[PDB]
Amino acid sequence: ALKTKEHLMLAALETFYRKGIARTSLNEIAQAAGVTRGALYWHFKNKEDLFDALFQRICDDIENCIAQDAADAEGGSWTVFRHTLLHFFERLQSNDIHYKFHNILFLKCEHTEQNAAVIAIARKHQAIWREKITAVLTEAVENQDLADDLDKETAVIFIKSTLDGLIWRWFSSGESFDLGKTAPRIIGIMMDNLENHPCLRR
Amino acid sequence: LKTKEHLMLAALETFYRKGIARTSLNEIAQAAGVTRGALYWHFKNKEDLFDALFQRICDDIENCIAQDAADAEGGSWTVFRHTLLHFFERLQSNDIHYKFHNILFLKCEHTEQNAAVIAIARKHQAIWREKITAVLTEAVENQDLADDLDKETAVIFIKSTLDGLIWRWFSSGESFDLGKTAPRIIGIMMDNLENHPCLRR
DNA sequence: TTACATACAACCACGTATGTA
DNA sequence: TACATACGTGGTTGTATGTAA
Ligand SMILES: [Ca+2]
Ligand SMILES: [Ca+2]
Ligand SMILES: [Ca+2]
Ligand SMILES: [Ca+2]
Ligand SMILES: [Ca+2]
Ligand SMILES: [Ca+2]
Ligand SMILES: [Ca+2]
Ligand SMILES: [Ca+2]
């Protein structure tokens, strides 16, 4: 019977991805899941609770692969950081669930205060990235991989901005360019800038 | 036109503070000084109001980008740096341009059924593709950038760099000083186009 | 005729109550 | 329980109508 709930959340993701969330009625999710609105209201209080339960689960799974890809990675924290970033963008192509998650967060939702769950998922995703980037940066200067006078506060903004822009451009372009070729270049330039550009120094 | 200008600016603020989908034309009307009869007179529906409001603003954005470059303070690539710097100063000081980008980033759904949103996004992107491409060709015909620069990747690299700064600044709730951050991130971006070998072919 | 305000009719989505197995 | 169906409601929309420029 729990298959019905997982069907609903995946039907929610698919419908959220093709119509945006606001234009998605609970009836449309139910029809896409081959069920009725009674099924949804049974498992979920409303559309907000369905979006939150769906995007809390996916956001946790994203945090897990970034953690799992790093723990199974040999080398220094700064070497596996490139490793974790490349796999993140590979999942954007190959992992449909993670792909739709990010695409919905960037393009097909309104980040405004009345959409409480959207603002909550966005901050959760950003706090995850802030946590990973911050810890990687401290470890990378404790190993001379980056200079000990690195402007690390500016570095987190620089890193997250660079990656958000690639994700945004890729989505907003309608995937007009090859993420598999572009992301390695943009990440390498980003990491080269953190090693050698003087403006990322204090 | 005084009523029509009130409506579009009231639409701009209401679109900004509540998002577009959650914005009834009733709320726009009472956020303005009028009723829905005023809106349906000047506009066919919410999409026609959003398009007229956002075609006019996006044109004004394209005009300041052009006006500050036509006030050529130096070479084509030297002027390009300042067109970008003036663009991010406008995002702080110009409340209309600020909302426009804020509404066209975190306050709207880029989905096919919202025809005018997709159309304005395409326009705004085509604006930047034209400016960036023309700047890049003039900058290699002046040796400011190398003759083997990956021009196709350069536009993606430039627009991604700028969209990410705008996205991050908005998404963080303006957590950081863009007056200080954008010059740094622009300069690193422009230094990368001069000297990074991966922006070469 | 314009330039609106008000009135009217309709639907769409929602939440809940209820049937049911 | 785990749904499907039925019911009642409001919010938004679009249009019709009124009315003073
Ligand atoms: Ca719909
Ligand atoms: Ca509303
Ligand atoms: Ca007002
Ligand atoms: Ca201002
Ligand atoms: Ca009147
Ligand atoms: Ca209700
Ligand atoms: Ca009855
Ligand atoms: Ca209607």
Numbering used by the authors:
A (entry chain A): 8 to 209
B (entry chain B): 9 to 209
What does the literature reporting this entry say, word for word?
The mtrR gene encodes a transcriptional repressor of the mtrCDE multidrug efflux transporter genes. Previously, we showed that MtrR adopts a typical TFR fold: MtrR is a functional homodimer composed of nine α-helices that form a C-terminal ligand-binding/dimerization domain and an N-terminal helix-turn-helix (HTH) DNA-binding motif. For example, MtrR represses directly the expression of rpoH, an essential alternate sigma factor that is important for gonococcal oxidative stress responses; DNase protection assays revealed direct MtrR binding to the rpoH operator. In this work, we report the crystal structures of MtrR bound to the mtrCDE and rpoH operators, which reveal a conserved, but degenerate, DNA consensus binding site 5′-MCRTRCRN4YGYAYGK-3′.
MtrR was crystallized with a 21-basepair oligoduplex of the rpoH operator. This structure was then used to solve the structure of a higher resolution Semet-MtrR-rpoH complex to 2.60 Å resolution by molecular replacement (MR) resulting in final Rwork and Rfree values of 19.9% and 25.6%, respectively, after refinement and model rebuilding. The asymmetric unit of the MtrR-rpoH operator complex crystal structure contains a functional homodimer of MtrR bound to the double-stranded 21-mer encompassing the rpoH operator site. The root mean square deviation (RMSD) of the pairwise alignments of all corresponding Cα atoms of the two subunits in the asymmetric unit is 0.11 Å. Furthermore, the MtrR residues that contact the rpoH DNA are the same for each subunit. However, the average major groove width is 12.5 Å compared to the average major groove width of 11.4 Å for ideal B-DNA. Therefore, the major grooves of the DNA are slightly widened, which likely occurs upon formation of the complex when α3 and α3′ insert into adjacent major grooves of the DNA. ; however, in the MtrR-rpoH operator structure, one subunit recognizes a 5′-TpG-3′ step at position 13Bp14B and the other recognizes a 5′-CpG-3′ step at position 14Ap15A, again where stacking between the R44 side chain and cytidine is maintained.
